[PDB]
C-alpha cells in the first residue's frame, strides 16, 4: 500500500502539471482525468487497492478477520512468537490498511477539486485574453530550474 500511495500521488501530480497546458479543452482535461484513474486502477497495485475496496463492501469479512486476529493474539503462544511490537501491529492491521486507503481518496479528491476549479472558466473577453497570456507564461515556467536558488 506504500506503493499504491506513491502511484496515486504521482498520478495527481501529473494531472496537475498537465492541466497547465492551455491547449487542453475542458473535454481534454476531463478525459485525461478519467483515463488516468482507469489506468492507475487496472495496474497491479491498482488491482490490490480495488480488491481491498471491494472487501469493504463486504465489511463482515474484514471485521471477522480483525476479531479472529484478536482471538489469536490472545493465546499465550503469541507472546513467544512475536515481541510486543509485532503483536501490536498485527492486532491493528485491518485499521492500518483502512486508514492508509484514505490517502488514495485524498489524492483523488485533490485532483477532482483542482479540475473543478479549472473547468469553471467561462471567461469574459479581455479576461480570456489575459488568461491565455498566463497559461502561456506558466507552461514556460514548467521547464525552468526551480532548484537553483540563484536562478
Amino acid at each position: 500500500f506504500r506503493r499504491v500511495e506513491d502511484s496515486w500521488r504521482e498520478a495527481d501530480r501529473a494531472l496537475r502539471q498537465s492541466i497547465i497546458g492551455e491547449q487542453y479543452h475542458r473535454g481534454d482535461i476531463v478525459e485525461r482525468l478519467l483515463n488516468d484513474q482507469d489506468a492507475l486502477l487496472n495496474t497491479p497495485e491498482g488491482r490490490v487497492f480495488d480488491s481491498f475496496q471491494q472487501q469493504l463492501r463486504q465489511s463482515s469479512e474484514l471485521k471477522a478477520m480483525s476479531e479472529r486476529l484478536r482471538v489469536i493474539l490472545s493465546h499465550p503462544s503469541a507472546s513467544d512468537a512475536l515481541n510486543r511490537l509485532q503483536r501490536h501491529d498485527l492486532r491493528w492491521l485491518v485499521k492500518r490498511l483502512v486508514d492508509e486507503s484514505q490517502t488514495v481518496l485524498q489524492a483523488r479528491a485533490r485532483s477532482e477539486r483542482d479540475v473543478r476549479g479549472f473547468m469553471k472558466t467561462g471567461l469574459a473577453a479581455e479576461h480570456h485574453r489575459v488568461g491565455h497570456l498566463l497559461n502561456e507564461f506558466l507552461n514556460l515556467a514548467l521547464k525552468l530550474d526551480w532548484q537553483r536558488q540563484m536562478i
Binding site: 479528491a109 477532482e112 477539486r113 479540475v115 473543478r116 473547468m119
Partner: protein
C-alpha cells in the same frame, strides 16, 4: 494523560459514568472534518457533472 488529569480535577459535576468515559477518558478523534471533506468532494463532483 494530563488531559484526563485536569478533566478529573474538574469533576465538580461528579456526574454519571457515560459522561466519565465520553468526556474525561477517551482522547477525541471524531471525524467531523472528514465528513465535511467527503460531502465537499461530492459537491465538487456534482459541480463537474452540472
Amino acid at each position: 494523560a494530563f488531559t484526563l488529569l485536569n478533566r478529573a480535577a474538574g469533576l465538580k459535576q461528579l456526574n454519571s459514568i457515560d459522561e466519565i468515559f465520553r468526556e474525561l477518558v477517551l482522547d477525541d478523534h471524531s471525524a467531523f472534518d472528514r465528513a465535511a471533506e467527503v460531502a465537499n468532494s461530492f459537491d465538487g463532483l456534482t459541480e463537474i457533472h452540472q
